[PDB]
Amino acid sequence: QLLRIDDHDFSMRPGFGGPAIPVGVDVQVESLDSISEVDMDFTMTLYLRHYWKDERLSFPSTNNLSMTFDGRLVKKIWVPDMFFVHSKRSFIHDTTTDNVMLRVQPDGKVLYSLRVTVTAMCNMDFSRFPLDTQTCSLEIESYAYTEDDLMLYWKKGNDSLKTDERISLSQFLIQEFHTTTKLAFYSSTGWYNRLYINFTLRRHIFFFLLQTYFPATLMVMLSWVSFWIDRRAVPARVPLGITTVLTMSTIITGVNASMPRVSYIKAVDIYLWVSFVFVFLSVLEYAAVNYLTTVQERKEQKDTHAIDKYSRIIFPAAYILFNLIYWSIFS
Amino acid sequence: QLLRIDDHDFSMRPGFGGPAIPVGVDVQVESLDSISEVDMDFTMTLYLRHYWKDERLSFPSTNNLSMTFDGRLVKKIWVPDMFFVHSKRSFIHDTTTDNVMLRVQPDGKVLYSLRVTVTAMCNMDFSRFPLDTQTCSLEIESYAYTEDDLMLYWKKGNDSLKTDERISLSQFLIQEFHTTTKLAFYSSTGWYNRLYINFTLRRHIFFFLLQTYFPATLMVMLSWVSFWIDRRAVPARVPLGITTVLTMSTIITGVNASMPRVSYIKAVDIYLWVSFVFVFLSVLEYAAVNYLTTVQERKEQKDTHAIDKYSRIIFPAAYILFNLIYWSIFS
Amino acid sequence: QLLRIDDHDFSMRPGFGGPAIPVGVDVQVESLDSISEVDMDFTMTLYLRHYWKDERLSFPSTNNLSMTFDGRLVKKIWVPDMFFVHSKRSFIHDTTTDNVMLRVQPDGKVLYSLRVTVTAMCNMDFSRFPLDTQTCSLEIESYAYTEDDLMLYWKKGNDSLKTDERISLSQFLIQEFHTTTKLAFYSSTGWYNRLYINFTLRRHIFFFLLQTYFPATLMVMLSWVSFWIDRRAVPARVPLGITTVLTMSTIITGVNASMPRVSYIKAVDIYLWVSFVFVFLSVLEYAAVNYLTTVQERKEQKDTHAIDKYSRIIFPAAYILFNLIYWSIFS
Amino acid sequence: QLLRIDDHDFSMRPGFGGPAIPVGVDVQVESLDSISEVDMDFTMTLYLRHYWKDERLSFPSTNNLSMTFDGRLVKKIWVPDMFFVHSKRSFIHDTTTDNVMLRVQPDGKVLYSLRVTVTAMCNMDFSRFPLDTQTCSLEIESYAYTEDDLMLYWKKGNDSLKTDERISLSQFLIQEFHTTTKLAFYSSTGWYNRLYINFTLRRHIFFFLLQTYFPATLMVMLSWVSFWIDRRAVPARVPLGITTVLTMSTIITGVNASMPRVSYIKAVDIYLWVSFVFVFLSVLEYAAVNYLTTVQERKEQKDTHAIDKYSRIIFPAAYILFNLIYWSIFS
Amino acid sequence: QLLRIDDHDFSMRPGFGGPAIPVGVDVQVESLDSISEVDMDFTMTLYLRHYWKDERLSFPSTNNLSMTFDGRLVKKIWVPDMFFVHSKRSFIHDTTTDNVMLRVQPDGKVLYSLRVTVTAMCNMDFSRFPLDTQTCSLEIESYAYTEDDLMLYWKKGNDSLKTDERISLSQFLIQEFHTTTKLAFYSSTGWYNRLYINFTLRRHIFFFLLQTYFPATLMVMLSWVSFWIDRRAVPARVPLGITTVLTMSTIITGVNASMPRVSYIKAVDIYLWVSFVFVFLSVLEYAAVNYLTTVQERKEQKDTHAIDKYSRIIFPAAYILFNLIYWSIFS
Numbered sequence A, B, C, D, E: 001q002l003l004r005i006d007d008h009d010f011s012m013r014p015g016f017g018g019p020a021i022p023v024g025v026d027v028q029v030e031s032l033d034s035i036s037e038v039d040m041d042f043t044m045t046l047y048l049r050h051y052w053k054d055e056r057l058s059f060p061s062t063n064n065l066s067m068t069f070d071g072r073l074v075k076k077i078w079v080p081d082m083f084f085v086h087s088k089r090s091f092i093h094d095t096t097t098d099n100v101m102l103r104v105q106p107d108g109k110v111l112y113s114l115r116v117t118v119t120a121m122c123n124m125d126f127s128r129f130p131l132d133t134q135t136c137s138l139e140i141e142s143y144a145y146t147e148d149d150l151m152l153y154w155k156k157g158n159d160s161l162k163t164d165e166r167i168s169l170s171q172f173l174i175q176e177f178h179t180t181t182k183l184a185f186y187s188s189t190g191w192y193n194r195l196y197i198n199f200t201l202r203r204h205i206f207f208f209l210l211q212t213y214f215p216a217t218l219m220v221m222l223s224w225v226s227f228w229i230d231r232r233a234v235p236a237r238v239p240l241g242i243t244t245v246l247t248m249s250t251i252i253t254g255v256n257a258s259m260p261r262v263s264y265i266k267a268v269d270i271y272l273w274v275s276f277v278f279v280f281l282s283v284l285e286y287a288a289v290n291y292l293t294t295v296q297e298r299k300e301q302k303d304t305h306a307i308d309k310y311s312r313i314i315f316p317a318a319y320i321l322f323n324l325i326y327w328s329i330f331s
Ligand SMILES: C[C@]12CC[C@@H](O)C[C@@H]1CC[C@@H]1[C@@H]2CC[C@]2(C)[C@@H](C(=O)CO)CC[C@@H]12
Pocket: B205, B209, B213, B214, B217, B323, B327, B331
């Protein structure tokens, strides 16, 4: 055997009872799988690498080059115990074998790599939905060893993060990849060191505009055509107004089916409900005209009405002003 | 080897054949994942810690400080067998390794930690839905050892429970975390000791008001506009009343799709069905007026009707009185 | 070692080559999880206990009391091979360890306990849905040993079954827990002994009445208001009848979405389809009146119609008679 | 030890380097779980048995009777490697232990049994849906050994297949169970022997008739009532025709939601689309009558129409003739 | 033992510390399971084979023929570590045992086979939906060994890919199977060799035409019948136009439910929205005619209109011209 595995007890970390052993980390991101709004989490697949030195794995050689083993010797030597904080579920690929790489240098330097898929939670805000921007992060920490036994740091600082050129999302735009570092404290175990991977996401507005905003505007303009119809056709104008109200209500209900039960109103809800009020007022507009006409005929017994003439101009002006204000605030 | 594992039989608990061995528990709650109304359960992720003493794990040292091991030695020593009562499913994270911490003091004190995700059932009441308040609890108990072999208690009493500052729910408000203790009895095994973790939840009413209460009120007020229309436009008032009835029926059906099949009526159902009656009576109101007008014309052959004039005042008054009573009982 | 495990071959049952060894069973039911109508199965969680004697596990002592082991010694001794017949899926909880209890008396008596969750199929009949009553059972049998090698019986007869006081179902009522015993035969292995656990379930009718029966009745009574309207308002009565027909059709379609594709008609289907016929005949009623009026005017050229007057009384009488008969048969 | 397991190398099949060893198979079917139309597969649970002889397992005895072992000795002896061809997923039950039976005769005959649940794909044709008939089969084959090393055959020919009396499907009728045998060839490994289990399935038509065919016919007959209404009530006949068209379109859309995206038209689609044409032509029928009446009045200025009179007879006759032809082809 | 497994250390690859060891791959495709548009991935089941030589597995014989082992010896020898790049989930069938084949020649040649099901992502474009064509590929690569330690190549070049004759998709047409080879580079591990399997898919247009295109055209032609009706029947033409608009809106909404939220407009959306404009303009057409008639009567106070006469010809001509252009671009 090139390595004297049986001659050492690997139940203790290198430098047991002494100073902490530094550990390096390199991360390459492969792809992002899915994002859930109701569950507020994301899925990521990445390659995780570790760097440390152990004199117990030294072997004699003359070339001074790294040597690669099959990978099943990992379960017989000491390995760090990094874990993902605030994660919901994760696993390691095992086809056709465990995705494990083990390279040992003659002086004892060890390279360890893994391929994992991790799901982590992220707190999102939907105040500006669907024109919002979300930021999420991934955390890496050691579970068992504190800062007095193991020191965790990025292997090459800002250059330790790499991303595949094929990473893309159908509904989101990915940008601003960077890493940071911060300490963590637990009241009953001590202090630990954490590593962060940050990114930013931006939605695409084309789908929401075509599916929600355009149908809403068309329904509002449909109610305006009743002002150009003669008021004597009562069974012809009343159904027009009512059907528009019912259609607008159906549109509002269908939008909320794909969003969670938040406690605050979203930007899309404001636009839909304001449009509902405009259509509702249109129905009441004809009711006033009909009542006044009946009273006028009764008084006389014992042309275009003024309300209709002014409604032709006031209603389009108010809606256009609302759009200018609404789109200026939300850009 | 620092620990003489092979020199002892760890198939028996410490103090075998004698007095019970005390065990301490510390719990830190990380996050709450989801709540299901149809399944009546919740998901929680937390850190579980154990405290006990075993003289068989003593090792000589001079510093008198805790020493940390990699964690795979756990399967070779005695470990408590705590389990969650009334749970449906649960698992332990194993990425990149099992989330296990093992610290042994020179005198034999042992610290054991785990990271688990547990789903437990909770009996909820929906008599005041969606303005209800729910209380749920989590139970921890030893499966194999009774009170005569193992004693279970909180390590620091009221101070043994900690919660993360990031715990939040989109639809619920979390409050009132506390712990209690109670004994349990089984008819064929004996007595056991249980530990409890309690919390309270409160819903948010904004979503339900906007999605259900507001559309219901608007439909009811839509039927009131028919009283101001001339009764001679029969094909103009009948469609107005009928379409409101159909729309109200659609609203009622859609609400129940997200709730289980309970055997009692909820608060939201009362409001919706009362509104349905109001719209239904509105349709019958015009039928009486039309019939009386036809009879009056026939009698004469051989203005505003009195029913319409009184309906303009009675109907709004009754609905407002209902709202005052309904919102006073349910606050 | 207190037990001489290594001195015996546990690959053979006690009393190998001789008479059968009796085995006792005790069962305590914890909770019922869910019931599926489309899949026709139920999920149950329970505690399973076994009783037998093995002289190879005897150890010397003076107190003559049961001793409890950690539970990992089970995989080194002989254990029965009970399994659940007609089950679809099942598993054993393993958090934080396997829920296994092992107690051995000095004379060799052994107590073995497990905690499992089992899903078993049940053949249900929906002829009286939703006022039906269903009976299901759970079967326990030994897989490998016949009656000539292992005898299976209840430990205490009728007293071997216990149920938790917290067992409840939102939609069903649980009652009539009892156990029976019957033999089973296989054409190629021999005879076996089976154990049964039986229970009965009853649905709650409040949800079905409010969601289905009440809307159906209201729609039928809505068609009756057309008989009190003047027949000269043709565009006012025809839409009333047609909209009721379409609404009734929508109600019928939505009910079947939650039931499987059975080959027989259910009780709820009879009520809905009879109501559909009543509304359909109402539409045809006005068509006859309109045609006769046109013919009468044409004959004359060259008040209340008799059909309308009789329809006001005949239609309510027929529907009430149908309800009396329908509710008398199904109680 | 009764069996000299440690004295032989079980890494080689019996008769290594010589003639093939015959293997027998017995199969008993327990139940069928589910059938998926979109995924085109079925799930089956069955008992699998094997028969072979191995002189290395011989033990001395005088009774000459089969002896049963606990079953964990299987992993220490040679076992066939049968697998299911064209399967998607499968597993073996392991509660409370692996469902494994091992019986060895004194001369060396071995009986091996297993309990598995297998999902296998089946190619179905929906040209006659929902009045179609489907045939599916299950395949058993050895993965590692060819015909020159292992010979596979049915233990008792036609009598090797047994079925439980409780096998039933809610939507399908099961019949025609039989077994066949055929060889298989691979271009790079050689020849193999396969075993087949065949069965036939037939759907139930009651659900489809009541849910789809009856509503379609009623809508078609609803359009026929407009021919008996006076043509002067234009706003009374036009809504009747249009609402029937929209309702028919809704029925057609809902049916396809439960079927995959096939590239050929089904039997149910033909009936629905022909009915849609009949209703569509009814709307065009009144348009011609209205236009001709207006032209006739204009010409005159400068009773029952002939089209309506003929439509009362032609339309019912055509639909009845279509039903006779449609139901004669599909029986 | 025929193979001297215990006499070698299989933790190192053959030719350790020297030149790379060539590895051959053979692939036979069994079936394609499903394709998801929202998730943009596909599922494939295939047989994977490996070819290499290892002198440590040599055994003496005279026949010089391949010998087959049970397959559990794989976990005791060196095996390649191939994995699928850009995959989401995958597993290996294990019923009734692991689908593993191991054949070793006397000189040391080894044959290794597996049966796996792999889900891999594919980037699709929906600019021409539903008349689009998609291309997807599958990637195979070694995870641990670079090109300096292991060389990967196709065993027989273009002849190494085989497909089952039963491969079919209900909605897609499969064609153009071929394989390629390309190198891959990682910034922190080195260079690797990849293998590709490519295929092309084409949709079927029959379902989309019948379900979407035909209903859209019929609704457009329904609005054209209003031009042949007398303009004095105001309550008869206005409902016709409005109901067509609402029906067209319902059709548009239902189509997008089965597609993801892309940021570009599809071919089907263009056809639907253009038809919506045609129906919308039809409603405005009658409004102009009604207003002009009222003004003309008022001026006179103090036949067929010209707009209707021209609309009968202009509207059909424009729609036909649009269809010719639309179907010429998309073929
Ligand atoms: C506006 C509306 C709903 C819409 C119409 O029915 C009118 C009522 C009037 C009473 C309101 C109620 C919404 C909920 C309110 C604001 C209650 C709450 O603070 C809820 O916690 C107190 C009074 C309630």
